[PDB]
Amino acid sequence: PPEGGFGWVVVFAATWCNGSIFGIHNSVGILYSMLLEEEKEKVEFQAAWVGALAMGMIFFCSPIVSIFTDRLGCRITATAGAAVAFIGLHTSSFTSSLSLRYFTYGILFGCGCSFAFQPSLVILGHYFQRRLGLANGVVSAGSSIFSMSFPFLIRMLGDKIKLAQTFQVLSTFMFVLMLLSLTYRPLLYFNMRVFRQRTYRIWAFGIAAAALGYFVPYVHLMKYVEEEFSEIKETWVLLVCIGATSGLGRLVSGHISDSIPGLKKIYLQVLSFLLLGLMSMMIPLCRDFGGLIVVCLFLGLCDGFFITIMAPIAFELVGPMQASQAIGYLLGMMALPMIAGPPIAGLLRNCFGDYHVAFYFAGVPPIIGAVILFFVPSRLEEELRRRLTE
Amino acid sequence: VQLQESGGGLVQPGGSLRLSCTASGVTISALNAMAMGWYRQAPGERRVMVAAVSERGNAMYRESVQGRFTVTRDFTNKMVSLQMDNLKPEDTAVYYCHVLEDRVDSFHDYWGQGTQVTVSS
Ligand SMILES: COc1cc([C@H]2Oc3c(O)cc([C@H]4Oc5cc(O)cc(O)c5C(=O)[C@@H]4O)cc3[C@@H]2CO)ccc1O
C-alpha cells in the first residue's frame, strides 16, 4: 500500500465524516435541553429517549452495515448513508410532533450515520499498513476537535433563530459529507466466520464488558460538578480540558501504536481500562477543583488510548479481508452496554441522592474488562493449545 | 534450529526422571521468539505433544501428563528442562525435543533425537 500520497485526502474525508456525525449528535441534545426549559410539554422521558435512540442506532446497526459494505463497496455504502442522513435531517424541520420526530430523527438520521460510519473506519486500512496507527490517530484527533467546535459555533452564530432552521443549517454538513464520500477509491450472509478466533472473541467480550461502565464519567461529571462545590463559576473549563487532552492523547496514542509489534498493542487498552477504573473510583474522593482538573487530563488520555487503537488491533487480529466484519460486530456488541450505563447511573442518583455510589459502581466494569483482556491468548499459545488438545 | 543432546532414563513406578539440554543451529535472539516443547510416542500411538513452554513463559500440559510433570526454560542458554515426578508404567514411551516458530499464516517446526523413558516394576 502507498502509505501516503492519495491516502491523505481519504484521511481528510474520514475526519470530516466522524466530526460532523458526532458534532451533530452532541449539538442536537444540547439544543433540546434549552427548548425543554423554555417551553412546557404540549414527553418528559421520550424527549431524551429519542436522542438516546439516535445515538445508539449508530452502533446497533453496524452488523447490517458490514454486509452492505462487503457486498457493494465503501464508496457506495458511505454515499447512500450520507444521502439518507441528509434526507432525515432535512425532513426533521417539519412541524413539531413527537411521533414524527421519533421516526425522522431516531431512525432515518441514526441509520444514515450508521451506514456512513463503518466505511470510514474500514477505508483507511486500504492505504496505510505501516502507518495505520498514525492515520487513525490523525482522524480521531480531527474528529475530536471538529465535534468540540459545533456547540461553540452555533450557540453564538445562531442569532436566536428558531429550532426549525437549525436542522436546515445542519443538513449542509451531511450534504458536504455526501460529496466528499466520492473520494473513497478501492484497492482490494450471517456467516459468523470471525467468531472462530478465541483471541477475537475474548477481546470483543472484554471490550463489551468494559463499555457498560466506561462512559459514565464522560456523561455525568459535568453535572456532578454542578451539584458538588457548585460555587466554581469556571465549570466550563473542564470540558475544554477534556477535549484538548483527548485530542492530544489520541494523536500520541496513534503515533505510539506503530512501534508496538503484534498483539502486544492490547496492553495499552489494558492499562487504559485500569487507569480509568481507578480514576473513576477516586473521583468522589477529590475535594479540590485544582485536583479535579488533574483528573480531567487522565480521563482525556484514557479516552484516546481506548478509542484510537481499536481498528488497528482488529486489522492485526483478523487480517485486512475480515476487518470490516470484525469492526461491525465489535460495534454491534458494544451498542447495548454503553446505552444501558448512564441510565443506571441516573437511577442510582435518584435512589441515593448523590453520585458517589454511581461512580463507585461505574469504576468496576472497566476493571473487569481489563482483567478479561489480560488473558487474551498469544499467537504461539493458540497453536500450543491446539497441539496439546489434538 | 537443531536439537541434538537427547536423554532418557529408567525407573520404577512412583519414581522420577529429569531431562535438560541445549539446542543448536540457531541464534539465541531468534530462539527467544520461538517456543520449546516435548513430544510423545508410545508403541502403537500417534505422535502428540505433552508439554511446552510458550513465548511469554506460560507452561501448558496435556491431560495425561498434567498435574505430575513440570517444564522450565532457560532462554539465554537455549535450554528447556522437563521434570517427571511420580512416574507410572503408562508413561513408558519415546519422547522428542520440539521447537516451534511463528510465521505469516504458517509455522516452522523442528524435531530432535528420540529420548527413551521407561517405567518397569
Ligand atoms: C446517550 O447516552 C450516551 C452518551 C455517550 C457519549 O460519550 C461519548 C464518548 O465518551 C466517546 C465517544 C467517541 O466514540 C467513538 C467510538 C468508536 O468506536 C470510534 C470512534 O471514533 C469514536 C469517536 O470518535 C467518539 O469521539 C462518543 C460519546 C457519546 C456522545 O457522542 C455514551 C454512551 C451513552 O449511553
Task: Give the CATH number, domain containing residue A54.
Answer: 1.20.1250.20
Given the CA of residue A144, which atom of ligand 1 is nearest to it?
26
Q: How far apart are CA A134 and CA A256, in angstroms?
A: 8
Three-state DSSP class for residue B17 = strand
Q: How far apart are CA A166 and CA A162, in angstroms?
A: 7
B120 assigned to some structural domain: no
Task: Give Cβ neighbours of residue A95 (< 8 Å, ≥ 6 apart).
Answer: none
Q: How many CB atoms lie within 10 A of CB A224?
A: 20
Q: By the 8 A CB rule, do A360 and A229 touch?
A: no
Q: Last residue of a domain, which of A135, A161, A190?
A: A190
Q: CB of A52 closer than 6 A to ligand 1?
A: yes
Q: Provide the β-strand partners of residue B112.
A: B3
Element (H, E) at B30: helix B28-32
Q: Provide the β-strand partners of residue A132.
A: none
B48 reaches A (C-beta below 8 A): yes
Residue B111, domain extent: 8-115
Residue among A141, A273, A264, A176 nearest A215 (CA): A273
Q: CB of A25 closer than 6 A to ligand 1?
A: yes
For residue A220, report the distance from its CA to the centre of ligand 1, in Å. Answer: 13
Query: Distance from first CA to last CA of chain B, Å, rounded?
Result: 38
Q: Verify that A247 and A342 share a domain, yes or no.
A: yes
Nearest chain B residue to A382 by CA: give it.
B54
A387 reaches B (C-beta below 8 A): yes
Task: Give Cβ neighbours of residue A139 (< 8 Å, ≥ 6 apart).
Answer: A11, A14, A15, A18, A120, A124
Are A384 and B35 inside 8 Å of each other by CB? yes
Given the CA of residue A55, which atom of ligand 1 is nearest to it?
1
Size of interface A-B (CB pairs under 8 A): 36
- The residue to which cell 477543583 is assigned: A289
What b-and-e string marks burial along A247-274, b requiring 16 or more CB atoms within 10 Å of the CB?
bbbbbbbbebbbeeeebebbebbbebbb
Q: Verify that A166 and A281 share a domain, yes or no.
A: no
Q: Last residue of a domain, which of A190, A211, A234?
A: A190
For residue A301, report the distance from its CA to the centre of ligand 1, in Å. Answer: 15
CA torsion A209-A299-A255-A113 (nearest 10°) is 60
Per the structure block, which three cell numbers stand in for A314? 482488529
Q: Is the dihedral of CA A326, A328, A329, A334 positive or negative?
A: positive
What is the CATH classification number for the domain harbouring B79?
2.60.40.10
Per the structure block, which three cell numbers stand in for A139? 482522524
For residue A22, report the distance from its CA to the centre of ligand 1, in Å. Answer: 8
Q: How far apart are CA A363 and CA A370, in angstroms?
A: 12
Q: Last residue of a domain, which of A155, A190, A225?
A: A190
Residue among B68, B23, B73 nearest B50 (CA): B68
Are A388 and B58 inside 8 Å of each other by CB? no
Contacts of A383 in chain B (CB under 8 A): 100, 107
B100 reaches A (C-beta below 8 A): yes
Contacts of B60 in chain A (CB under 8 A): 381, 384-385, 388
Q: Verify that A21 and A106 share a domain, yes or no.
A: yes
Q: Verify that A30 and A83 share a domain, yes or no.
A: yes
Q: By the 8 A CB rule, do B69 and B16 touch?
A: no
Q: Which of B50, B60, B107 is nearest residue A385 as measured by Cβ atoms?
A: B60
Given the CA of residue A214, which atom of ligand 1 is nearest to it?
10
SS (H, E, C) chain A: CCCCCCHHHHHHHHHHHHHHHHHHHHHHHHHHHHHHHHCCCCCCCHHHHHHHHHHHHHHHCHHHHHHHHHHHCHHHHHHHHHHHHHHHHHHCCCCCCHHHHHHHHHHHHHHHHHHHHHHHHHHHCCCCCCCHHHHHHHHHHHHHHHHHHHHHHHHHHCCCCCHHHHHHHHHHHHHHHHHHHHHCCCCCCCCCCHHHCHHHHHHHHHHHHHHHHHCHHHHHHHHHHHHCCCCCCCCCHHHHHHHHHHHHHHHHHHHHHHHCCHHHHHHHHHHHHHHHHHHHHHHHHCCCHHHHHHHHHHHHHHHHHHHCCHHHHHHHHHCCCCHHHHHHHHHHHHHHHHHHHHHHHHHHHHHHCCCHHHHHHHCHHHHHHHHHHCCCCCHHHHHHHHHHHC
Residues constituting chain B: 121
Per the structure block, which three cell numbers stand in for A92? 426533521
B93 assigned to some structural domain: yes
For residue A253, report the distance from its CA to the centre of ligand 1, in Å. Answer: 18
Q: Verify that A94 and A106 share a domain, yes or no.
A: yes
Element (H, E) at B29: helix B28-32
> How many domains does chain B contain in total?
1
Nearest residue (by CA) to ligand 1, atom 3, is A339
Are A383 and B56 inside 8 Å of each other by CB? no
Residues constituting chain A: 390
> How many domains does chain A contain in total?
2
Q: Verify that A241 and A290 share a domain, yes or no.
A: yes
Half-sphere exposure of A141 (CA within 13 A, CB side): 18
Per the structure block, which three cell numbers stand in for A50? 429519542
Q: How far apart are CA A332 and CA A66, in angstroms?
A: 10
A155 sits in the region (left: phi over 0; alpha: psi -120 to 50; else beta) called alpha
A379 reaches B (C-beta below 8 A): yes
Nearest residue (by CA) to ligand 1, atom 19, is A307
Are A388 and B49 inside 8 Å of each other by CB? yes
Q: Which of A379, A381, A383 is nearest residue B58 as measured by Cβ atoms?
A: A381
Three-state DSSP class for residue B37 = strand
Long-range contacts of A223-231 (CB under 8 A, 24+ apart): A224/A283, A224/A355, A224/A359, A225/A292, A227/A354, A227/A355, A228/A355, A229/A287, A229/A289
Three-state DSSP class for residue B3 = strand
CA torsion A32-A35-A40-A42 (nearest 10°) is -60
Are A378 and B107 inside 8 Å of each other by CB? no
Q: Verify that A165 and A92 share a domain, yes or no.
A: yes
Q: How far apart are CA A353 and CA A188, in angstroms?
A: 56
Site to probe by mutation for ligand 1, drawn from A15, A203, A307, A336 as the one with most ligand atoms within 8 Å of Cβ, is A307
Are B102 and A379 inside 8 Å of each other by CB? yes
Strand pairing of B69-74 and B79-85? antiparallel
Q: Verify that A166 and A221 share a domain, yes or no.
A: no
Which amino acid is residue A109, in one-letter code? F
Q: How far apart are CA A286 and CA A265, in angstroms?
A: 32
B1 assigned to some structural domain: no
Alpha carbon A331 to chain centroid distance?
A: 9
Q: Verify that A141 and A251 share a domain, yes or no.
A: no
Q: How far apart are CA A3 and CA A282, in angstroms?
A: 42
**Residues A48, A111, A72: CA angle, nearest 5 degrees:** 165
- The residue to which cell 458511505 is assigned: A78
Q: Verify that A180 and A198 share a domain, yes or no.
A: no
Q: Verify that A120 and A222 share a domain, yes or no.
A: no
B106 burial via Cβ count (<10 Å: 0-12, 13-18, 19+) = exposed
Q: By the 8 A CB rule, do B12 and B119 touch?
A: yes
For residue A353, report the distance from its CA to the centre of ligand 1, in Å. Answer: 26
Residue A253, domain extent: 193-390
Q: Verify that A152 and A223 share a domain, yes or no.
A: no
